[PDB]
Paper text:
By engineering a protein that dimerized through a highly solvent exposed disulfide bond, a system is created where disulfide bond breakage leading to monomerization is easily measured by [name]. In this way, [name] was able to follow a residue specific rather than a global damage process and link damage pathways seen crystallographically to those occurring in solution with much lower X-ray doses. The X-ray radiation induced dimer to monomer transition was pH dependent, suggesting mechanistic processes, routes for further interrogation, and mitigation strategies. Here, our system is engineered so that the reduction in scattered intensity is from the dimer to monomer transition through disulfide bond cleavage, making a global damage indicator into a residue specific one.
Comparison of the elution profile of endoHCYS in size-exclusion (SEC) chromatography shows that transient disulfide bond formation leads to dimerization in approximately 75% of endoHCYS (60 kDa theoretical, 53 kDa experimental) in solution. The protein crystallized in space group P21221 with four monomers in the asymmetric unit. The monomers have an average RMSD 0.289 +/- 0.016 Å to the original monomeric structure, indicating that the cysteine containing fragment did not affect folding. The cysteine containing fragment and disulfide bond are un-resolved in the electron density but is not unexpected due to the deliberate placement of the disulfides in an accessible and already flexible region. The position of the N-terminus indicates that the disulfide linked dimer forms between monomers across adjacent asymmetric units, yielding dimers with chains AA', BB', CD', and C'D. This arrangement with the N-terminus of adjacent monomers positioned in close proximity is not seen in crystal structures of monomeric endoH. The distance between the modeled N-terminal Val-8 on partnered monomers (13 Å for BB' and AA', 7 Å for both CD dimers) is such that the length of the introduced fragment can satisfy the gap and connect the monomers. Aligning the dimers shows slight differences in the inter-monomer orientation, which is most likely due to crystal packing. A PISA analysis of the interfaces within the asymmetric unit suggests that there are too few interactions between crystal packing oligomers to for those interactions to form in solution. The difference in the location of isoscattering point in calculated and experimental scattering curves suggests that the conformation of the dimer is different in solution, perhaps through freedom crystal lattice restrains to rotate around the flexible linker.
Residue numbers in the entry:
A (entry chain A): 9 to 275
B (entry chain D): 8 to 274
The structure:
């Protein structure tokens, strides 16, 4: 019954629980304050012996996935999609420097295998901390990310793929006559506290020019950025770092503008 | 063998890293410092509900760095590197923009100047985040508090450095009662790491850093691009944040090549 744009919440599972995303609803009965929860974050690692990238989960990320039944399914039951973000991890392998289509495809299978095993709704790409060049890896090239996303989308035609619009991967979305922009569901501004339209050939309904960090970004700014989201006709609103505290006022700061309603907490 | 180029600045999170790393990077051509200004991040503004009076608060690590200034600070100053103390909100309602009166703002300013002199610092940096205006029965930001505080502070230290992290309520409230305090600052920089945003402040370009980079997270190519744009366009400051204890020779040289025409070298 809620109508406005799609709300997104990155959660740093190293410090906080995914379930807090589901504790905020709209006073006027519209539904959840948040539409998408993102687990931050899995990693892309490099195995120097085999000279091969692989998907890696730290102790915290692995705990959330292993406990998907208490840590994920309840959000999904409420209607909240859950994604896994993937980040560089200082080992030289990154989303933009796969040496070949087959190599990018091997990684896509690992991502899609993880989405399937743990019942996830999709994946989010964050191309930072890769440290391209460590362990004798190559610098970014023009084809790696297009190959990777092309394979992932073929693997998961029904799942969400989203882009944290930063890093070398973000500027390499077209290769060999294929622009993979329409293979993403969403793209959003990575600079928390600011408004910045992603220059990506995706419709406005799937873009978040605004990005805020709950608990740090001024409530004045949260509200203004959500008002601009609606005013200019955009369809996504990115938030990061919701914790376990009482953020009713922080959340209401944008639910007031996105949905015309204030937020209430479940406990 | 002197260095010609914009003044580079290094925010150091002392909760995790030592100030001394800032002095560990010199230029391969001439041996000047890669970094001209180190900023201890960060002291706090607390409220104290009894007195109803804001006070300068140091956390365990900041207190340790200041108490041990002889080994953590003086070596940098003796190497020619100025050392500033950042001040940040701390969730207790008092912030730089909601002092109720000139007198109370002047009282907090005396605490800052006193601490500058006691520990032999070179000045103070303002970061107006996390204050949580309204907590403990505090007021919302007003138009006068920050002008009063900066006027009193500059009166206390005519010879010291006062810098502005360009974010938060205080950074839009620089004029009141016929007094514009823009020229009372020595520097003002973009808070949005990874980006280029010229502060809209009535300071000369030589005292502005539109560039902001996080060492170890911002891509080296972005570090270099922003450093090149700083020289082009003619700005006088280049802000870096979060230098750690690892070997960041390639990250530092990424900007020193463009700022000063020379690679950096560690130890
Ligand atoms: Mg689509
Ligand atoms: Mg395109
Ligand atoms: Mg700025």
């Amino acid at each position: 019954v809620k109508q406005g744009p799609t709300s997104v919440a990155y959660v740093e599972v190293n410090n906080n629980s995914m379930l807090n995303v589901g504790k905020y609803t709209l006073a006027d009965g519209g539904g959840n304050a948040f539409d998408v929860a993102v687990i931050f974050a899995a990693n892309i690692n490099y195995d120097t012996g085999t000279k091969t990238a692989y998907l890696h989960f730290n102790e915290n990320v692995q705990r959330v996935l292993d406990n998907a039944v208490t840590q994920i399914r309840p959000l999904q039951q409420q209607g909240i999609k859950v994604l896994l973000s993937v980040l560089g991890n200082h080992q030289g392998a990154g989303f933009a420097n796969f040496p070949s289509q087959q190599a990018a495809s091997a990684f896509a299978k690992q991502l899609s295998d993880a989405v399937a095993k743990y019942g996830l709704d999709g994946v989010d790409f964050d191309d930072e901390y890769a440290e391209y060049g460590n362990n004798g890896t190559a610098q970014p090239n023009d084809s790696s990310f297009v190959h990777l996303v092309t394979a992932l989308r073929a693997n998961m035609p029904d799942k969400i793929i989203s882009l944290y619009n930063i890093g070398p991967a973000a500027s390499r979305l077209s290769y060999g006559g294929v622009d993979v922009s329409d293979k993403f569901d969403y793209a959003w501004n990575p600079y928390y506290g600011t408004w910045q339209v992603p220059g990506i050939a995706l419709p406005k309904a799937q873009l978040s020019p605004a990005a805020v960090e709950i608990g740090r970004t001024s409530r004045s700014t949260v509200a203004d950025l959500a008002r601009r989201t609606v005013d200019e006709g955009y369809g996504v609103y990115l938030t990061y770092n919701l914790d376990g505290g009482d953020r009713t006022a922080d959340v209401s700061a944008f639910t007031r503008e996105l949905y015309g309603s204030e937020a209430v907490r479940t406990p």
